Structure formats: C-alpha cells, structure tokens
Write a protein that binds this ligand. Structure first.
Ligand SMILES: Cc1nc2n(c(=O)c1CCN1CCC(c3noc4cc(F)ccc34)CC1)CCCC2
Ligand SMILES: CC(C)CCC[C@@H](C)[C@H]1CC[C@H]2[C@@H]3CC=C4C[C@@H](O)CC[C@]4(C)[C@H]3CC[C@]12C
Ligand SMILES: [Zn+2]
Length: 370
C-alpha cells in the first residue's frame, strides 16, 4: 500500500531521531563527567553533540510531522520561518564546529610549546561561543526576510526555503567554504605532524652524537660543548612539555662547568637511558596527535559525504527547473535530507569505534554505572 510508504518513512525517521538524541546525550555525558576528556577539542565535540541533539529534538520531529501531513505545513506561518532558521542554524553550527576544530588544532600544533600541560578552558569556551555566534549570524537572513515575506519560506503550501539566491548563498557559506577550509587544514596538519616527527628524529640524532662525543672526551671544554648541544636538542624535543630531562642535562652541565670530567661523563651515561625513554615518549605523543587527526578526518568525511547528496540534488533542482525530472528529484531530496540527518546520529558510534575512553564510558553508561 502507498500509505504504508508514509508509515515506513515516519518510522525510519523516528529511528534516526531516537538514535541521534540518545547517542549525542551519551557524548554529552562522556565529556561532562570524564576529566580525561577535558581539552579544547572535546569541548568542541560536546558542543557539537548538543547541537545535533537540538537538531534531533526540535527540527527532525517537526520534519516527521511534516512528512505525516503530506508535506503541508500544519503549524502557524511564522513557525515555518522559525523552524527553517533553527534547522540551518544547527547544521551550520555543526559544520563550523568541525572547521573550528580543524583550524584550532592546526594552529595549536604550530606553537612550539603545544605539548605543555597548561591549556585554558575559558579560551576554548570563548571559541565555542564565537562559533555559535557565527552560526546565528549566517542563519539570520531567514528570520529577517522570512517573517517579512511569506513567499521566501513557503513553496506550494510546503514549508521550504524557496528563495534560489538564499539556497545558493547558503550552500556556499554554510557548506562549501567550511568544507574546503577543512580539507586544506587537514592536509596541512598531516604535513606539520610529519615535520614534527622529522625534527624529533633530528633531536635524537644530535643527542646520540653528543653522548658518543662525551663518552670519548678528554677535557671539560668539549664535555660542556657536547652537553650544550644535547641540552638544546632535548629542549627542542620536548615541544614545551616540560620535564626533568633538561634539568638532568643542566646538572651534568654544572658538573662540567666545575671541571669535573669523570663525574660529568657518568651523569651523561645515566642521561643516555633517560634520553631514550623521553624520546620514545615524545614520539608516542606525536603518534597520538596523528591518530586524533585521522579520527577527526573520519568524522569530517562521514559528515560531509552524508550531506553531499542533499546539496548536490538541491543545487541541481535550483539550476534545472524543467530540464531534470522533479518527481524523482523530490524523492531524492527527501531521502538525502534524511541521510544528512542520520549523519548527526553517526558521530557517537564513531567515537565508540576509534576511542577506548569513549567506548568504556558508553559501555558503563548503558548499564548505568557511574
Ligand atoms: C526538513 C526538510 N524537508 C524537505 N526539504 C528540505 O529542504 C528540508 C530542510 C532540510 N534542512 C536540513 C539541513 C540543511 C543545512 N543547512 O546548512 C547546512 C550545513 C551543513 F554543513 C550541512 C547541512 C546543512 C538545510 C535544509 C526539501 C524536499 C522536500 C522535503
Ligand atoms: C559547555 C560548552 C562546551 C558548550 C556551550 C554551548 C553554548 C555556547 C550554546 C549551547 C546552546 C546554544 C544556544 C542554542 C540556541 C540559540 C538560539 C539562537 O537563535 C541564538 C543562540 C542560542 C541561544 C544558542 C547560544 C549558544 C548556546 C547557548
Ligand atoms: Zn605535537
């Protein structure tokens, strides 16, 4: 039966709604409770999850109500523009949250002391508020012109963004520009991390060369010279983390400055083991940045690929009003809108897959074990 089609569409819509709300609430709880997940990127991801939850709680159920009424808007006229504004607001906020994550992490890894433990919570919160304000500013044209003009938000009785200029400018400002920025920033990030690993290997090379020089030293002058080169290398290798290693090298360097050559050589001998350990630690930190980069790239790819069919079909239907068939186009737009909405529910599953802390948190939350 063809009414069974409406029943199935509404049912699958409800499935997507419940999945979105539940998963993003799980992400909210994970970021709100775990102190192991309290850096800037996780604050951005929790803001992202609340945005997706607001989308799945205020916008997607109204879309289900719309698809139940034969796509005829049953609510008051102003609520159509309000609902389109909220929809565009939350989706634009999501994509620009992703863009801000990419850019912020890139700018961070640019800073030569970005491995220090001192990160400010308030700065990340201010960035999140700035992104939400950007989203509100991008979405304001719909309330401005939509409440003034009933025709720009209504399309044959149906509550759709009918202005072609609005559609194209919103596709560019809200989807295409942040997508391109995301791609560029991601590839620049992989290049910067490669540079980081290369510099770390160079620091290790310097450390080994000067340890070997110290092992065969004769007088205090060359001991101090090799220890100075070692101190520079070790300070560079920490990427601002801040450890005992440079302090131990300074202890050996004091021994060298006093003229004690044998004791300085013994100190360098202990430093050899300490240096191997710390170098491996720094390499592991770089590898962790690489893994986080790839996971966030998976997130970006899933979101963009799931929203791409809708934007493709929408811009195409704006271009060809009669060249292309519009019944199949309307069916495609329905299906692709709901795929893009499914993108909002996909994220917590991805957090579960490639993150052990998120997965443990969710496994303990399903059983209510806090
Ligand atoms: C409910 C509905 N139902 C129908 N149609 C609709 O367009 C709609 C509106 C669908 N909104 C979903 C979010 C979109 C969006 N805005 O900004 C973004 C930025 C992003 F990164 C990703 C996505 C977006 C804009 C449209 C037309 C066919 C008939 C049924
Ligand atoms: C705790 C941290 C990490 C997240 C903070 C999220 C804050 C900044 C977000 C969450 C929900 C957001 C609000 C959701 C909806 C609207 C309606 C819009 O027309 C004006 C902005 C406004 C009022 C948003 C302001 C920013 C907001 C309050
Ligand atoms: Zn780093």
């Amino acid at each position: 039966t063809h009414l069974q089609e409406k029943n199935w569409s509404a049912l699958l819509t409800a499935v997507v709604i419940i999945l979105t709300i539940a998963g993003n609430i799980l992400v909210i709880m994970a970021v709100s409770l775990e102190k192991k997940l309290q850096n800037a990127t996780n604050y951005f991801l929790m803001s992202l999850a609340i945005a997706d939850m607001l989308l799945g709680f205020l916008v997607m159920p109204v879309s289900m109500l719309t698809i139940l009424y034969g796509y005829r808007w049953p609510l008051p006229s102003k609520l159509c523009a309000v609902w389109i504004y909220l929809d565009v607001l939350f989706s634009t906020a999501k994509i620009w949250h992703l863009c801000a994550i990419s850019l912020d992490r890139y700018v961070a890894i640019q800073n030569p002391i970005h491995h220090s433990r001192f990160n400010s919570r308030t700065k990340a919160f201010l960035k999140i508020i700035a992104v939400w304000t950007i989203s509100v500013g991008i979405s304001m044209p719909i309330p401005v012109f939509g409440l003034q003009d009933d025709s720009k938000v209504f399309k044959e009785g149906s509550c759709l963004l009918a202005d072609d200029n609005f559609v194209l400018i919103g596709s560019f400002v809200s989807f295409f520009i942040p997508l391109t920025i995301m791609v560029i920033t991601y590839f620049l990030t992989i290049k910067s991390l490669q540079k980081e690993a290369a510099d770390l290997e160079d620091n290790w090379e310097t450390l080994n060369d000067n340890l070997k020089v110290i092992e065969k030293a004769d007088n205090a002058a060359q001991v101090k010279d090799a220890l100075t080169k070692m101190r520079a290398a070790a300070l560079d290798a920490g990427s601002g983390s801040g450890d005992i290693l440079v302090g131990q090298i300074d202890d050996a360097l004091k021994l060298a400055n006093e003229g004690k050559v044998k004791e300085a050589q013994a100190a360098a001998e202990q430093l050899k083991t300490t240096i191997n350990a710390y170098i491996q630690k720094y390499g592991q930190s770089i590898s962790n940045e690489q893994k986080a980069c790839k996971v966030l790239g998976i997130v970006f790819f899933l979101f963009v690929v799931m929203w791409c069919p809708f934007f493709i079909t929408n811009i195409m239907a704006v271009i060809c009003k009669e060249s292309c068939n519009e019944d199949v186009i309307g069916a495609l737009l329905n299906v692709f809108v709901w795929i893009g909405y499914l993108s909002s529910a996909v994220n917590p599953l991805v957090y579960t897959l490639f993150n052990k802390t998120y997965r443990s948190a969710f496994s303990r939350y399903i059983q209510c074990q806090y």
